[PDB]
Design an enzyme around this catalytic site. Structure first.
Site, PDB file in Angstrom:
ATOM      1  N   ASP A   1       0.960  -1.083  -0.121  1.00 15.19           N
ATOM      2  CA  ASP A   1      -0.001   0.041   0.043  1.00 15.19           C
ATOM      3  C   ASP A   1       0.868   1.111  -0.307  1.00 15.19           C
ATOM      4  O   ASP A   1       2.141   0.900  -0.373  1.00 15.19           O
ATOM      5  CB  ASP A   1      -0.854   0.131   1.098  1.00 15.19           C
ATOM      6  CG  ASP A   1      -2.049   0.836   1.248  1.00 15.19           C
ATOM      7  OD1 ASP A   1      -2.627   0.853   0.059  1.00 15.19           O
ATOM      8  OD2 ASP A   1      -2.648   1.476   2.052  1.00 15.19           O
TER       9      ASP A   1
ATOM     10  N   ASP B   1      -3.356  -1.063   5.103  1.00 20.15           N
ATOM     11  CA  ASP B   1      -3.613  -0.711   6.095  1.00 20.15           C
ATOM     12  C   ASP B   1      -5.378  -0.273   6.184  1.00 20.15           C
ATOM     13  O   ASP B   1      -5.828   0.467   6.876  1.00 20.15           O
ATOM     14  CB  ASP B   1      -3.141   0.101   7.194  1.00 20.15           C
ATOM     15  CG  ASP B   1      -2.983   1.502   6.402  1.00 20.15           C
ATOM     16  OD1 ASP B   1      -3.283   1.496   5.331  1.00 20.15           O
ATOM     17  OD2 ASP B   1      -2.408   2.403   7.022  1.00 20.15           O
TER      18      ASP B   1
ATOM     19  N   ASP C   1      -7.780  -2.674   0.747  1.00 13.00           N
ATOM     20  CA  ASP C   1      -6.612  -3.425   0.907  1.00 13.00           C
ATOM     21  C   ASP C   1      -7.262  -4.744   1.267  1.00 13.00           C
ATOM     22  O   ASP C   1      -6.471  -5.883   1.387  1.00 13.00           O
ATOM     23  CB  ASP C   1      -5.725  -3.020   1.674  1.00 13.00           C
ATOM     24  CG  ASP C   1      -4.822  -1.915   1.231  1.00 13.00           C
ATOM     25  OD1 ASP C   1      -4.416  -1.935   0.301  1.00 13.00           O
ATOM     26  OD2 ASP C   1      -4.607  -1.057   2.007  1.00 13.00           O
TER      27      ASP C   1
END
Ligand code: PC1
Ligand code: Y01
Ligand code: Y01
Ligand code: Y01
Ligand code: LMT
Ligand code: MG
Length: 1030
Positions: free
Chosen positions: A416, A735, A739
């Site tokens: 990410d 996070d 995701d």
């Protein structure tokens, strides 16, 4: 493609099926659980699709789903509904009922929905809930406990109870029962936490035809209902399409970006409404509406379009719900065919010895449990329990311990960006003041700047209130005033430590004119001063040209192309007297007139301090680092170049794809960017277009691509799956709620958040950095190496006990209950629990553990170790025969009646040491674990067990009553047995060392594996031969 099978029911056939599958045996229901097609063919008769009460959905893949009626016959396959249209006689998904309607239809839907039509559409589309079925404990038990290996363990326990072997039977039963109950509890808890996660119950306001407005629960929404959004804003219950007003949405669910998004009313026209084309007029489910304005009309209106599993959140949850070990099962199958051969041989020799048929079949079936160890999965789970405990100590929480072994196979880790690699929020890089009309150097920390107009502009030109003894409001102005060091007291402000200044009037920030303005005055001043802050570009069009530099545009683009978030500020001297009696009656059009640009304040999403070391460590150990984000491509590329994913010397080539309109095909455009070897940086739309229109060129993109920006959650999941189709072991560190599908689809998904993502991810990190990626990779390499050692030990143990029991079946004897119990419990449990104990190496290396349990090294080790073992055992047994004091074992009666005898005594004395020797031989240290000599419990246990066994052999009458061991008086023969097993202790270690050191080199020298079977390795090779983008 899907094929449907219509199976109605017959009551006589139903009772016949029930009786034939219940009274006969339990095997038919099991084999039908393996293949439900036969079961549904026998249980229900084939009928036409217009009368089916059961469907067989094939994708082939067999699923069965009962057709349900409310009339409207429907069925739910993987959450998505399919209804029955009587007219054209087919099952049509509910998503495709109103699919393709025009924007004018959505606009006509603004009046409301009739309650009868609401009933019809709630029948069709169902309630607006994302329902996860939480199975009951029997429903999970019939799914898990009927595992083939649990069935083999139950057979083994039944046979051992039929063989008076109650103690190891009880141990294995307790182990399997507690493991099964713990797994059921874990699975039910995960299902319950997921169902609590996706749950959304809230009161919403819906328009009704005729002007009435009623408050219904968010589950009573159906596509067509006209939502009335609140002005203060709130969470979104269903995918809607704005038909009036404007909104500011926090789409961090979809994009992972907390930046506000402007959504405007849908434009009226006769064009197909599309979530991808009209994404700026569509409110998605799960995204938080910050504020909603209604310029025309009393309130903002949104027309529901998707509800339940049809929404974007629904699609992500549907992907979550409905997505070595193979070599281990293949080796236990080889052990099973060896069991069959040894079993028929045992029947042969036991019949030769005149053994009764009941005990013949008992012994022949018991050899199966001997050679196929019922305690192998627990032995191989102990190491993952140790690794899970170490991870929990380090802050990383793994919910399923056996997922740690996958951390050791990782070849690629997808990252990410916002919140994982970079900080969650923006931080101020600095402010660039103006001295006349030319720019000044960037001032990194605005506080040191002298006390002038621009500093009060930074510290006061904002709309934030004081509550909870903390400033609250929009994060950017919050962090800017936090940087200036001023503490705030319209409202009054105090400097860091330089006179207190109070703002007299403030104007609201509206996204139309895209700026905000305030007027301020202080005692001892000339006249009140105005401050203007907003977009950088447009306010430069408001200030006088001789105040804004000519190089404003190129500097603004240099800031913006790096992913910065620039905001400009200007001021105004007001000729009005300093008193709010005339200041708050001012029209702000006077303020934004005749402006003078003070300077630009630049804010950039900082990189975490723990990001660059971890990325450089991963790239050092030949682990690919991929950035799959939801932010723009400029920011993603800048962060990649800055966090070490793209080294300063490496080439980044942007990949751009244009979707083919009518008259032209699709195109790929590569434009490099000046500062493996080549990295491709492609967007989300480009990824979709390459997946659809260029499936030939997708593997090279996935092999070279490093930066994937503007990726939707479904696109992150698709990217992880497309990378795993290249035979990658993909890890994912994120996070966010975007995701979740990727953390579920990834082989090792690590979540840094404690909300909405710790549910789906196997791992959850208590820390916020990506330092948990090398930790998990080291623990996974350790657990993989340790599970290799434990599998080799259990294989060598089962084969050694197989040989020892064959040598004793041939001569009409056996080991006996207590020798068997010693070998099975005391030696094996101790060894398999203390082998799995040593921790990982302190540093990551470039080479990962082997992932195949059928490797030529592993099988060669097992073969040579067992050759040495059978050599030593047969040597001891045959030297026993050559002795003068040796006497036969009274073959006329079988064990345990003829125990003790010299043959059993010698075979047990040798085999018992061999178990410890093989335990110590198969255990390794570097490069994946700490050295073996640090495992002081294991070395002490080996020493103590070897001392006990040497006391058995040497010390007379010691534990020879319980174990039923014959006392050998010839001390020379005891020393010869000890020298023989010391020969074995040396030979096992020398064999292991010689193999590990030479066999890789010999295999490289004899048969050069010039071709790797991994697909990504073939792609890398052919790319090094011929680069794809010239
Ligand atoms: C007597 C047993 C008492 C201790 C059992 C502890 C159970 C546990 O925490 O493990 C759960 C885990 C969860 O596994 P899972 O497969 O349910 O996930 O499974 C086990 O119980 C493993 C048992 C380890 C002991 C095996 C030793 C035999 C060596 C030969
Ligand atoms: C048939 C019967 C007799 C078998 C019984 C075996 C158990 C006694 C074994 C199996 C699992 C073992 C546990 C596996 C995991 C660990 C974690 C370990 O703690 C740590 O690893 C922390 C290290 C760190 O964080 O630095 C302590 C031992 C313990 C509980 C082991 C204790 C002994 C256990 C309970
Ligand atoms: C009469 C005979 C047939 C049986 C005697 C009792 C057994 C059930 C005892 C004897 C040796 C015991 C084992 C001695 C050694 C260990 C290691 C121990 O693991 C740890 O020390 C955890 C700490 C760490 O790993 O850091 C767990 C218990 C266990 C398997 C014991 C399990 C119970 C055993 C098998
Ligand atoms: C009468 C009784 C007390 C007999 C005792 C037999 C000992 C001579 C054996 C038992 C286990 C053996 C140990 C088993 C394994 C190891 C690890 C080995 O370590 C390595 O080779 C380096 C690899 C790494 O990094 O782990 C050193 C020898 C040693 C301690 C062996 C030394 C000799 C030991 C202590
Ligand atoms: C590594 C070696 C471990 C050796 C541990 C074995 C110790 C066993 C002690 C328990 C003894 C049970 O009690 C013994 O049972 C056997 C057979 O069941 C009887 O025979 C004996 O008369 C009785 O003394
Ligand atoms: Mg994020």
């Amino acid at each position: 493609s899907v094929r449907l099978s219509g199976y109605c029911g017959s009551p006589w056939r139903v009772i016949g099926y029930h009786v034939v599958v219940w009274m006969m045996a339990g095997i038919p229901l099991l084999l039908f659980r393996w293949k439900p097609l036969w079961g549904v063919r026998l249980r229900l008769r084939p009928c036409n699709l217009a009368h089916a009460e059961t469907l067989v959905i094939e994708i082939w893949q067999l699923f069965t789903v009962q057709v349900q009626t409310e009339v409207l016959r429907y069925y739910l396959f993987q959450g998505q509904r399919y209804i029955w249209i009587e007219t054209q006689q087919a099952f049509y998904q509910v998503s495709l009922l109103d699919h393709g309607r025009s924007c004018d239809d959505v606009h006509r839907s603004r009046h409301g929905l009739s309650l009868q039509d609401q009933m019809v559409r709630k029948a069709i589309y169902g309630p607006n809930v994302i329902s996860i079925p939480v199975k009951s404990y029997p429903q999970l038990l019939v799914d898990e406990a009927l595992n083939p290996y649990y069935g083999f363990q139950a057979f083994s326990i039944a046979l051992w109870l039929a063989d008076h072997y109650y103690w190891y039977a009880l141990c294995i039963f307790l182990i399997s029962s507690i493991s099964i109950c713990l797994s059921l509890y874990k699975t039910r808890k995960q299902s319950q936490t997921l169902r609590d996660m996706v749950k959304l119950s809230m009161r919403v306001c819906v328009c009704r035809p005729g002007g009435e407005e009623e408050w219904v629960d968010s589950s009573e929404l159906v596509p067509g209902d006209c939502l009335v959004l609140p002005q203060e804003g709130g969470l979104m219950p269903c995918d809607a399409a704005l038909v009036a007003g404007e909104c500011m949405v926090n789409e961090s669910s979809l994009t992972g970006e907390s930046i506000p998004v402007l959504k405007t009313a849908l434009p009226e026209g006769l064009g197909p409404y599309c979530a991808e084309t009209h994404r700026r007029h569509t409110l998605f489910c799960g995204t938080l509406i910050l504020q909603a304005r209604a310029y025309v009309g009393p309130h903002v209106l949104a027309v529901v379009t998707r509800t339940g599993f049809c929404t974007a959140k629904g699609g992500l949850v549907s992907s979550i719900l409905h997505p070595f070990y193979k070599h281990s099962m293949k080796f236990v199958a080889a052990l099973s065919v060896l069991a069959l051969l040894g079993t028929i041989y045992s029947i042969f020799i036991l019949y030769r010895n005149r053994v009764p048929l009941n005990e013949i079949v008992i012994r022949a079936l018991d050899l199966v449990t001997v050679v196929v160890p019922p305690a192998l999965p627990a032995a191989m789970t102990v190491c993952t329990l140790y690794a899970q405990s170490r991870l929990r100590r380090q802050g990383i929480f793994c919910i399923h311990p056996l997922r740690i072994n996958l951390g050791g196979k990782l070849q690629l880790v997808c990252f990410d960006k916002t919140g994982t690699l970079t900080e969650d929020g923006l931080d101020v890089m600095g402010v660039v003041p103006l001295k006349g009309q030319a720019f000044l150097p960037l001032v990194p920390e605005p506080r040191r700047l002298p006390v002038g107009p621009l500093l009060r502009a930074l510290a006061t030109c904002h709309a934030l209130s004081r509550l909870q003894d903390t400033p609250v409001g929009d994060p950017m102005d919050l962090k800017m005033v936090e940087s200036t060091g001023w503490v705030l007291e319209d409202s009054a402000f105090g400097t860091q430590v330089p006179v207190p200044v109070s703002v007299l009037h403030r104007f609201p920030f509206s996204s139309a004119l895209q700026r905000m303005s305030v007027v301020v005055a202080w005692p001892g001043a000339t006249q009140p001063e105005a401050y203007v802050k907003g977009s950088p570009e447009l306010v430069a069009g408001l200030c006088n040209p001789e105040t804004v530099p000519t190089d404003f545009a190129q500097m603004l683009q240099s800031y913006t192309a790096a992913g910065y978030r620039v905001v400009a500020l200007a001021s105004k001297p007001l000729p009005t007297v300093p008193s709010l009696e005339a200041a708050q009656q001012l029209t702000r059009d006077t303020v934004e007139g005749d402006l003078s640009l003070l300077g630009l304040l630049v804010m950039r999403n900082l990189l975490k301090p723990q990001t660059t070391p971890v990325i450089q460590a991963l790239r050092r150990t030949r682990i690919r680092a991929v950035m799959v984000t939801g932010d723009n491509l400029q920011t993603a590329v800048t962060v990649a170049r800055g966090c070490g994913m793209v080294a300063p010397q490496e080439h980044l080539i942007i990949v751009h794809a244009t979707h083919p309109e009518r008259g032209q095909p699709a195109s790929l455009e590569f434009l490099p960017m000046e500062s493996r070897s080549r990295h491709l940086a492609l967007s989300g739309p480009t990824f979709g277009i390459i997946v659809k229109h260029f499936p030939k060129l997708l593997p090279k993109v996935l092999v070279q691509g490093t930066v994937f920006a503007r990726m939707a959650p479904e696109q992150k999941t698709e990217l992880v799956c497309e990378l795993q189709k290249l035979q990658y072991c993909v890890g994912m560190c994120g996070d966010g709620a975007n995701d979740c599908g990727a953390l579920k689809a990834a082989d090792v998904g690590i979540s840094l958040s404690q909300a909405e993502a710790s549910v789906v991810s196997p791992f959850t990190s208590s820390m916020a950095s990506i330092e948990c990626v090398p930790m998990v990779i080291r623990e996974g390499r350790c657990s993989l190496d340790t599970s290799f050692s434990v599998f080799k030990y259990m294989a060598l143990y089962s084969l050694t006990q197989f040989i020892s029991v064959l040598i004793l079946y041939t001569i009409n004897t056996n080991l006996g209950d207590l020798q068997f119990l010693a070998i099975d419990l005391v030696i094996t449990t101790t060894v398999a629990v203390l082998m799995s104990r040593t921790g990982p190496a302190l540093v990551l290396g470039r080479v990962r553990p082997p992932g195949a349990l059928l490797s030529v090294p592993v099988l060669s080790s097992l073969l040579l170790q067992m050759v040495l073992v059978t050599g030593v055992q047969l040597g001891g047994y045959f030297l026993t025969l050559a002795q003068p004091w040796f006497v036969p074992l009274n073959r006329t009666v079988a064990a345990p009646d003829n125990l003790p005898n010299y043959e059993n005594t010698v075979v047990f004395s040798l085999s018992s040491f061999q178990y410890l020797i093989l335990a110590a031989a198969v255990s390794k240290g570097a490069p994946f674990r700490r050295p073996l000599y640090t495992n002081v419990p294991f070395l002490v246990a080996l020493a103590l067990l070897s001392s006990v066994l040497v006391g058995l052999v040497l010390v007379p009458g010691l534990l020879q009553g319980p174990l039923a061991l014959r006392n050998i008086t010839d001390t020379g023969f005891k020393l010869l047995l000890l020298g023989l097993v010391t020969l074995n202790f040396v030979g096992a270690f020398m064999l292991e060392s010689v193999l590990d050191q030479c066999l890789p080199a010999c295999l490289r020298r004899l048969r050069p594996k010039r071709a790797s079977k991994k697909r990504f390795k073939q792609l890398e090779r052919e790319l090094a031969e011929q680069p794809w983008p010239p």
